[PDB]
Amino acid sequence: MKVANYINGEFKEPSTGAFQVKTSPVDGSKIAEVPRSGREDAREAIDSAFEALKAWANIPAIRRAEYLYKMLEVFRQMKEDFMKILTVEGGGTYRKVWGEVVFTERLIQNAAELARHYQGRVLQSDSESTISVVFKRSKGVVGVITPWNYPLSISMKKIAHTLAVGNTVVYKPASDTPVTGWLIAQMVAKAGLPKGVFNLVIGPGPVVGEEIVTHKRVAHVTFTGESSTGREIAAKAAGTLKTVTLELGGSDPLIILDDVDVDYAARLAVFASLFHQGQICTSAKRIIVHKAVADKFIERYVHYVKMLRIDDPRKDEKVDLGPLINERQVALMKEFVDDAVSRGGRLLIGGRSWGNFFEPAIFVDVDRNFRIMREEVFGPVRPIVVVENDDQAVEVANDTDYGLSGAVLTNNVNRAFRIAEAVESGMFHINDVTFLEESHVPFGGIKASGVGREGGEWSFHETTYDRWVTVTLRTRRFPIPSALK
Amino acid sequence: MKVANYINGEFKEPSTGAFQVKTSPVDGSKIAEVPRSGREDAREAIDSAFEALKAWANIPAIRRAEYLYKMLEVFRQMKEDFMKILTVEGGGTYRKVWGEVVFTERLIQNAAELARHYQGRVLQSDSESTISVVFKRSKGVVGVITPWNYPLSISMKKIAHTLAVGNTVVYKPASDTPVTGWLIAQMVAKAGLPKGVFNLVIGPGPVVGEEIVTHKRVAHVTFTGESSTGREIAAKAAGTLKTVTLELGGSDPLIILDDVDVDYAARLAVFASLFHQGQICTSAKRIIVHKAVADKFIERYVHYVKMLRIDDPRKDEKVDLGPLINERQVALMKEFVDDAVSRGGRLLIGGRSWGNFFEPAIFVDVDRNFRIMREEVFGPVRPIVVVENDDQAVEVANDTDYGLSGAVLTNNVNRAFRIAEAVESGMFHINDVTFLEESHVPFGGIKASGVGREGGEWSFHETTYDRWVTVTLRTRRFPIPSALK
Amino acid sequence: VANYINGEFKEPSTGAFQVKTSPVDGSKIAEVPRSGREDAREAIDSAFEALKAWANIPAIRRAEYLYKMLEVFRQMKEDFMKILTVEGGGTYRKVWGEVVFTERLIQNAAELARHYQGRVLQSDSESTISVVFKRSKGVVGVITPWNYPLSISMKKIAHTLAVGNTVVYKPASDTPVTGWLIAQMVAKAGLPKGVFNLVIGPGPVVGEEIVTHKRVAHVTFTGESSTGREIAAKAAGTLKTVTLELGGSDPLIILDDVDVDYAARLAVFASLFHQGQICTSAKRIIVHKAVADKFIERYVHYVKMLRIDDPRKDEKVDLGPLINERQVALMKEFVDDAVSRGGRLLIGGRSWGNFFEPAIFVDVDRNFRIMREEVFGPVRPIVVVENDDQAVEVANDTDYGLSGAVLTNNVNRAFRIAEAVESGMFHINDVTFLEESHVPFGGIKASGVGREGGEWSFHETTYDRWVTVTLRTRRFPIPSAL
Amino acid sequence: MKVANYINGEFKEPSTGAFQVKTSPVDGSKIAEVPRSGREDAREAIDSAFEALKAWANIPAIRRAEYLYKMLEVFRQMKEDFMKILTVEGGGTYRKVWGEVVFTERLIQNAAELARHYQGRVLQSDSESTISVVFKRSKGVVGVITPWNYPLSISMKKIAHTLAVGNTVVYKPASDTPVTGWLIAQMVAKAGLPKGVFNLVIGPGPVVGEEIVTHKRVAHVTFTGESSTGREIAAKAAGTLKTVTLELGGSDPLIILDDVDVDYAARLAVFASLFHQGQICTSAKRIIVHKAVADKFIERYVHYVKMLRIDDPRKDEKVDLGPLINERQVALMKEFVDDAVSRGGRLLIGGRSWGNFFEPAIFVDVDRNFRIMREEVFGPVRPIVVVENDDQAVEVANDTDYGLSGAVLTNNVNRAFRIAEAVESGMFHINDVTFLEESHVPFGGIKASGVGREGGEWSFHETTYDRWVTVTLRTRRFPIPSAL
Ligand SMILES: NC(=O)c1ccc[n+]([C@@H]2O[C@H](COP(=O)([O-])OP(=O)(O)OC[C@H]3O[C@@H](n4cnc5c(N)ncnc54)[C@H](OP(=O)(O)O)[C@@H]3O)[C@@H](O)[C@H]2O)c1
Ligand SMILES: NC(=O)c1ccc[n+]([C@@H]2O[C@H](COP(=O)([O-])OP(=O)(O)OC[C@H]3O[C@@H](n4cnc5c(N)ncnc54)[C@H](OP(=O)(O)O)[C@@H]3O)[C@@H](O)[C@H]2O)c1
């Protein structure tokens, strides 16, 4: 299957001539031949975006909204194609790629809905005869760099909202999910957006991504990926004084208190910690349980983990877990497991690997020095930690460099609110999963989980700037030269 | 006179023992002996602010207001001391420092007024039985790094607004204006803020400023200075994934169309372009004139420059201009004049310098390769360009790396608005000077002039983060394990 | 044509019918209900019962129904146009614009439903959480006029539904088939029973029941100011709130530094579109002495180009008839009054059937009826003034205060004049009846209270609810013996 | 001691020449001669206000803020004066009036704080080359009409906030608390406001108030009072199409679930339901408790009600309750106890009354047909209703014509929110008193409890209107005449 870049309105081959084969994580089957673009495909894309910017930003918002609704109609027609690819290229189960596609629809609609309603401000002026307002203005051409785990929805949240509010987009997907990127481009072009407004360039982050980050005609970069990558991207962005949105790692706590429906808490816990093989930035990566319910909770959780069906996600719709994205991740997960075992940890079930599939590894009796407590474990290896009181629940919760999401299960209004207040995270949920997400809410972290927020108006904040503009209606006397009446 | 750091409730001498001497830009006379602090002194300041943070952030906003209102009382009583020191250390005329002092009063008050009123949002949930809201949380320890040209007001806008909304502060004033910084510390202390909440550290930027910028326990740095400096700071800040506010340089365009009162235009142009010796970020640094009034305008502009009185800013109230801040700035103005003469620009007046003083130098017949058209000219050298039409005015206006402020002079509504939305600046003013500033408007630039906004709630946006928080009120079925209903 | 109650088209309990005839030629169009208080009471009761389920589904689900409704409207475009002309007397271009705008209104309501936000506050109390929600008011009365019965009905209806209220709708008696077509659309869109209700009856009966009923929480009204005062007074009884979009007598002010031809072309469209039957019509034209002669000359030149004919005949017809013969008689009274007081009729004034030519007057004074009253028809005065101050004085010399506009290229004159004119809406270098789907539409003085369009429609039909949570116990000041 | 009107910067006697004597609710001793004004007086004030409007509305907000900040200065100096009038004129205890006075300080500061920050909007335009903004404009002269139970704080929340955003004011206090209003005017005048910006007129509501409500040059009326009076005012206001704010009665429910600390619940309940003798719109007027703790709660509640100390509020700072505002109120309360006894209610305590003092009468075993369940009991009579579950609790809670505030005590987050969402009120409070109030939050009710919101920006919403303004920058073509 032949996949190209999308630049300035047309599908074209990389300037470098170089291609690469994308393989399925399921069985290593060849899916598509895809570009390995170089710095100049990037430059061509960026310049294409820059030229298209003036018209795009200056048409009325309602017109951009129409194009997005057009985008939404095409997408609805392309739903199966997207699912099919998210499953086979990305390793997602039916149910996983169903939710991603449903949410993506809601993401695109949301960007459209909001385009006409992003308001500036009329201000009171401290001077007489002065009108003092604030406009919203497009930043310009915006780079969009994304990960492989939820590559469709994460990309569209960035891309659609960026487009809505008058920016042009240069977009480079994760190299592990380039076909999904190509389907996006397909969708954009069947919607008929003007040449240059949206651009796809497939290639390596350190090369294509970096050129995007360091280019002078790029006003802003929005990025989702690892926290180390984020730090380098911020560093490089400083060169041209462009702004950034960094949606980085997470190691989110799921705290269970003792006044819960223990069974329910275990069902929820299993879902939050292990959906998409724990391949989720807002995954319940670290589980924190109250002593009084720990034993029953651990029995039930393991009971339910054991029931998880692992299989070729192409077989049927009821498969619970697919494989990890690549062989490298399986290796990292067996490291995480080994370190725990070696450190005197107790393995309750799983931890085997066959192919790119990894059987969920659940640990108890850990301390703060385990790799699975100090690093983001982006896969199906989870520590359970037992604590004696709420104050201890919060210390374990916050004992991380990360600060993305988090959650607490309880029926006590005070305990819920106190624990919410004390956990150091960008997002928090009382009595739900850690990876709750709506289209228009402010998604983002603190500490090492990143900087800024995305979703609806918050996405608009990121890709626009405030502009103070005034009009003075009465002439005034000026203080210099003091020799004037 | 002897000046000290203010750290953790207490005035103290540098860990390093080292003391520098601060002399007057007016005559070289010794003003005061000031610290030359080290990286050690910065860390002590930072940790103090960290330990004071929790208690300071968690009281109700109305307490924080009461302390700010308290600062306002104290500041009102010191006014003349701030005035004295701005003139004798910064070189500002009476009128200049009077204005800085009045605005600083409004700044302290604006931040106090708004503390209780910085709101979050209650959201419509896409999910049944879900409460979905967004809180405002303070960032934490905020580093405040300021320049020498308007050291009182630029500092206070940052310190007051940052404090109000629940952050703590480590402040490093410009090395050329350390006494102003110390006088601020006096104020804060006289107002009895809790120890550690506010901290002063007088020292070299590349060692004291850098420690602030790279420290772990600092969440945000708000910077005002050169753009080169900004790029540095933004890059080191990336190390700890902290956020920044960069208020960098400007080369703001003053466009004068042909339907104006030409004499008024001149009077405004002079004040805008040359006030405080043109050492103002939002100075009218590049004056752009319609050909139909160019001869008259230039005649008039030069006429009023001639009238500018340059003297000791301590002599009397009616002194138009004082010295530049040091020898280095004079040298720099000399290069600027050299280059422009070297390139065939017609020098109409000024150029004379003695000690730190400098008579304003006006040029015509320039082109876009002149250093005074490509760089920020942070002093009293000013180019005037004649253009033939509105397009041309705009093309020239946007021909710069900077995008801070800007202004157009006309009585025609279409011409004013079409020029306004065509010039690329963070701010813009119609029929007023380029450096309008009210205490609660979004102040800031685009392109190379920086990132973010400061003033009122915009200051608040910079030093807070949004936190999405939810409560789910009905239990749900989860997709895995699919076997289970 | 029938009512729509609790998900059913049904006959009026009174069994009475009345014939709708066409303003264009007097020919019968449809037999429509002539409902009474009982029919209003049933409708009200349906909406009240449907209320709790409809208010409490997520916004995204109400948005879905509206998008569904939007798709149905698109299918019915040519049906809505044909009625707006045959029933309402609108030209092709007039009804097309009404329909396009209605499309955008329906969409706007859907787009905004999910985005109507409350606030989170700083508490002056420690350990206290303090927030504000948005809640539906409940059952909402929607009472409308005949001049733009589609777009006016839908701005109210669509926006009111989106944000969780139920609706009892009552259209003007001169345009009920349009009201009925609306009921059609909602039914084909599949909204839950009771959520939307149509009752076609007389104002002082059906409308008054709606206004005075206990279970109605809010009434949104568009019509004459006298009715607005009736309605507001009767509404007081049950402490329900109202939105009153009332009459206009909008000034169009023309300064001396304008392109006079352009100014004239604009003037004709603003003052005369839909036979002047626009609340935001340029109803009083105000010109600066320095250009008054050429302006009047050009204005007249373009008015005599206007084509008044059967709006059914083709698409380039400029003007149709007035809605009925009372309106023609009243227009005669305005013209007759103006002539009697010594005013100069520049052009026009012929009538026939319900048709009525533009009548243009100059040399008038403030005592002319066409300067004191709303002239909801094609009779228009031009007033010459010597300077800006006088234009403003003349512009403000009215009980009304809906919209208004000034034509000029001088930024100061434009803005100072804007500050000074007393209206809810104002437009610089554009027509007086400027209208977008999401802007705060409404007036001051005698033109009403409140605002419709977008979030403002939501403001009208929601209330703010302050809710708190205290997380620490405290001591209390009584009994002091503790 | 003699009191005057305040019109156009001048303290003047009424046009009628007629005066009246304000006695104390506490012992009946004479307090002041106060005016009985007439329509001519209201008319003069309305005109003064009108004349004063243009200057006041046009100056920049910061200037209005400075005048307010100086009002704050004055009020701070007059604190003890306001306190002692709030007691001798209105019968508040030391603690009640202290709180009203602290809160009033806050309200005035809050008004000043916000004056410069009330923003309009910049809209996206569906047309090309169009600028589209929304301005905030002040309505004009504003009538302010207020009750007697919290005459300082309620008056001042309206007055200051209305003033802050550029309106002018014609203020008429309750005839039972006219001296408080006079002091307000004393304070305005000492702050040096432009003449006619603030006006005080003391007289009967049906004459002075009705004039304010019906006058063509009055733009808006913000009213606090009985719901019935609200209905009258709203009707009369329709004549000139002026807008109103109606802060009417309440009958708030306090719901106590069975998972609480019962003793604390009782302690809270006594404060919420009986503070200022129950003379609070947001008083906990109908108490609703779960069966599993009802016995224990009722005993405890009665225990602390019995401990209450009723006395001359002037004696000292520890008096829990003073008297009702007048003999009429005692009479009404007696009816309420009378009706409850005849309908089969069980009187657990209280009922003794001498002069204007009244001991809190507490009832159980009541039903929905009792007057004290169907009406606002603006005094110290309170029913306690036992329910079997959270459904019944909501059912009883919403069985009113009212819907001002309301509250629930419970440690269960699910029950707490479900209940709050279900109760029909303009304001709700989880685990605090029904009458929580801050300076800047939207205060107001639904149903019979009124229309609109007061407090900070919400006060500003009520006394301003939005103004859509556009600038079009490209000429365009028009559809008539089509021949072109
Ligand atoms: N906060 C959130 O919302 C969120 C959501 C999902 C996932 N995540 C995070 O995403 C991470 C896993 O994704 P990942 O393996 O794809 O992370 P990654 O290795 O950092 O890659 C992210 C993207 O950055 C590109 N990239 C790499 N180096 C670059 C450079 N020097 N300059 C510019 N771009 C560069 C990559 O392109 P290449 O393919 O060429 O490497 C990729 O498209 C996890 O840490 C997870 O927490 C965060
Ligand atoms: N956007 C605005 O609002 C605004 C307003 C006024 C001025 N400005 C700009 O400010 C500039 C003039 O002031 P300036 O010459 O003082 O600017 P600067 O040379 O860049 O230095 C300003 C501050 O940054 C500190 N600094 C220098 N190097 C640093 C480092 N590596 N790390 C941390 N801090 C460091 C300086 O310390 P030392 O003093 O010890 O070197 C000083 O406190 C001009 O560019 C002017 O346009 C901007």
Author numbering:
A (entry chain C), B (entry chain D): 7 to 491
C (entry chain A): 9 to 490
D (entry chain B): 7 to 490
Give the text the authors published on this PDB structure.
In the present work, we report the structural and functional characterization of the first thermostable archaeal dehydrogenase (AlDHPyr1147). According to gel filtration, AlDHPyr1147 is a tetramer. The AlDHPyr1147 subunit consists of three domains: the coenzyme-binding domain (residues 1–256, 443–470), the catalytic domain (residues 257–442), and the oligomerization domain (residues 122–144, 470–491).
Therefore, we interpreted this density as the substrate isobutyraldehyde. The oxygen atom of the substrate forms hydrogen bonds with the O7N atom of the coenzyme and the OG1 atom of Thr230. However, it would not be appropriate to consider this structure as a productive enzyme-substrate complex or an intermediate compound since the substrate molecule is located at a too large distance from the catalytic Cys287 (the distance between the substrate and SG of Cys287 is 5.74 Å). The Cys287 residue has only one (rather than two) conformation, in which the side chain is directed away from the coenzyme. In the ternary complex of AlDHPyr1147, the SG atom of Cys287 in the active conformation is at a hydrogen-bond distance from the peptide nitrogen atom of Thr288, and apparently this hydrogen bond can lead to a decrease in pKa of Cys.
